[PDB]
Ligand binder design. Structure first.
Ligand SMILES: Cc1ncc(COP(=O)(O)O)c(CN)c1O
Ligand SMILES: Cc1ncc(COP(=O)(O)O)c(CN)c1O
Ligand SMILES: [Mg+2]
Ligand SMILES: [Mg+2]
Lengths: 398, 398
């Protein structure tokens, strides 16, 4: 035995899945990507319905031009930390774009969203302090908790009551960080932020909200679920990503706290990594600024989401949500076999969706997760519904 | 008090530095970057001598063209994990480029070097196992240890003897990971890998070597210090980055272990983050492949390093190394004031180098760290030496 013997189980589990005859879901390659909604997979033209490209920004002509210009003018990389030689013109631009987008004085960009969560959580809450989070929080949030030295307080998923009871049992004096997500990514339902933030404030906690799955399409300014629920000016920190609506790679945290920018001085995942390439921060800047006023896209996105959600529910699919509350539509299946058969039938018929099985999901939960794009056409959505009808019948789901 | 009160000290320390009249070293902006060796900083044309762009790849015409083509053909981002919708043509290309570069069957790319270290260390060594590392290891290596659940065994910096004694006191049966760096980044000296790896193998440990600071210019194939020291086929895992010689952003681990690619199934910083943008992996692929045969650049790099090292030592600067052993030349100063005065004089005269002061360095260590580029000209290196002579005299260092 050696250090890799611990993976023998996972290797066996993968081979068991492949023995069923399914395409390996963890090894899909997009050989060509024609647009935000169309790819070539296994040599076949395929509609994409499993990406987080919510606003279709990845092929936006201004975004692409900004990226090409940055490569030409600044080269392929920075070869340094933000605290040394890695801050170029476009890094200052992208942080200002975020300030303008969120209406905040503070904005700190990280090289990934994962690192933003890892860093901000492990840096803000120290020994003797508390991080309070939903039981089903994103892995990066849990990993931030593990990286830090704070006391970790999980509360029952989606429970305002358990948040209140758990917070109330903590000592009053130590500082506390309540970490929430606007959209629950697994099923695409929405957190009761208004109520949970009121509870957080009652107990004197600071609040961090992750608005990765809402950027550009919730709230009057597209700032997220917190904005939609009337919490402007009440959220201490908002964390997000450049990899979803923005369409590149990177993370960020914004805040109006007067000492916020001091996080740069302490935050290990900010300090000890190269800054993002000029092209990445240039594309992000352009995308973020366009997202501030991307009303046509926002309306299309929601129209598409409502059509897909409404259509799938009407056919008799069990969905994760009764109403269309986000750009994620989760189809719930009875067992792992049904999920894989559905996923393969859709793929072979020209549609890519994400499958989620245990341990990605909780035991007994087997999902196809569809994610809508502003650049899906009404025609594509009807084609997708037709494909779900055909696959659902062939497999015996509906 | 709140969660940010803990930064009051760092805020005060920064203000104390600025009270001396120095430019804030942590807020330098490259307003224009003309080439790998020339920038505009504070409106002034400045020679760059503080980047990790060792092989000058960031303005390579093939690298830039590959990046522009990828933006055009695949868009600005992937909007997904490598385990789902985020693996495009160019991600498969970059992993194959690494296999070819290192002569390995296995290659796993991460979204940053930081995350590669964080992930590989915390995933390979579990509860009841051991990670053995140099006391002065890179922050990302320490952060990987913190993220995991293994027993952490520090050994005295650069001590083959302490590595041997510390390893030998551990129980024999549990699996062990010895983590080493080829180049010690602070002073630019080289690890005794041949001897330390022999010790690791005597005790049955697996070995991970970080070759971030050696890629393309140590060993016959440019694979790193381990290759230069004759250890081909003896290193279980090599970790690296795309942000230094390669000239973009990203991390990787390569290996010939038959179960290596199973790490994808378990590694949280691989799974729970978006993959790199098409342009980033395209530029990396092109750069990595060119680095395999970049002999002119390699010779220039070493010629430049020898000239700078030899020149600075001849003037009476105390260097971190007696001989030119890497592309980092560290100038050691007597106190923090001398370092800042030297750094400012160089900057005002048209030269950027990195300053390192406590707590970045150990107490009593005050450095200017110069990093050479293959695209520095002999003329630039002599200009730099002249600037060091003038600054060193004006400040009273030499
Ligand atoms: C809610 C949430 N927060 C943070 C992240 C991390 O973002 P990134 O992909 O930029 O690392 C993710 C990744 N899907 C996420 O879903
Ligand atoms: C030795 C070493 N290893 C790993 C890293 C992390 O690499 P990256 O900048 O790609 O995150 C660094 C960052 N300087 C490093 O110096
Ligand atoms: Mg095209
Ligand atoms: Mg130019």
């Amino acid at each position: 035995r050696d250090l890799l013997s611990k993976f023998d189980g996972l290797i066996a589990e993968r081979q068991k899945l492949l023995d069923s005859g399914v395409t390996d879901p963890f090894a899909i390659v997009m050989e060509q990507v024609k647009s935000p909604t169309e790819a070539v997979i296994r040599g076949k033209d395929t509609i994409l319905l499993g990406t987080y490209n919510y606003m279709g920004m990845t092929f936006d002509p201004d975004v692409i031009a900004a990226g090409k210009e940055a490569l030409e003018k600044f080269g392929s990389g920075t070869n340094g930390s933000r605290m040394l030689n890695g801050t170029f013109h476009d890094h200052m631009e992208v942080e200002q774009a975020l300030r303008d987008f969120y209406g905040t004085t503070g904005a700190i960009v990280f090289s990934t969203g994962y690192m933003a969560n890892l860093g901000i959580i492990s840096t803000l809450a120290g020994k003797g302090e508390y991080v309070i989070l939903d039981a089903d929080s994103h892995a990066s949030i849990y990993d931030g908790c593990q990286q830090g030295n704070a006391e970790i307080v999980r509360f029952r998923h989606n429970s305002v009551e358990d948040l209140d009871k758990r917070l109330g049992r903590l000592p009053k004096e130590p500082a506390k960080l309540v970490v929430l997500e606007g959209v629950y990514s697994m099923l695409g339902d929405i957190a009761p932020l208004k109520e949970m933030v009121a509870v957080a404030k009652k107990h004197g906690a600071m609040v961090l909200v992750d608005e990765a799955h809402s950027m550009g399409f919730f709230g009057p300014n597209g700032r997220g679920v917190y904005e939609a629920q009337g919490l402007e000016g009440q959220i201490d920190f908002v964390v997000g990503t450049f990899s979803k609506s923005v369409g590149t790679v990177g993370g960020f945290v914004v805040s109006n706290h007067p000492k916020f920018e001091a996080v740069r001085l302490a935050c290990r995942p900010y300090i000890f990594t190269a800054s993002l390439p000029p092209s990445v921060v240039a594309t992000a800047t352009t995308s973020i600024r366009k997202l501030m006023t991307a009303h046509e896209k926002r309306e299309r996105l929601w129209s598409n989401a409502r059509a897909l959600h409404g259509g799938l529910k009407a056919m008799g699919f069990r969905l994760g949500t009764e109403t269309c509350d986000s750009a994620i539509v989760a189809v719930m299946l009875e067992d792992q076999e049904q999920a894989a058969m559905m996923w393969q039938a859709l793929l072979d018929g020209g549609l890519y969706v994400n499958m989620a099985r245990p341990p990605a999901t909780p035991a007994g939960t087997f999902l196809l997760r569809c994610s809508i794009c502003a650049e899906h056409t009404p025609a594509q959505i009807q084609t997708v519904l037709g494909m779900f009808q055909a696959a659902g019948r062939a497999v015996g789901v509906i």
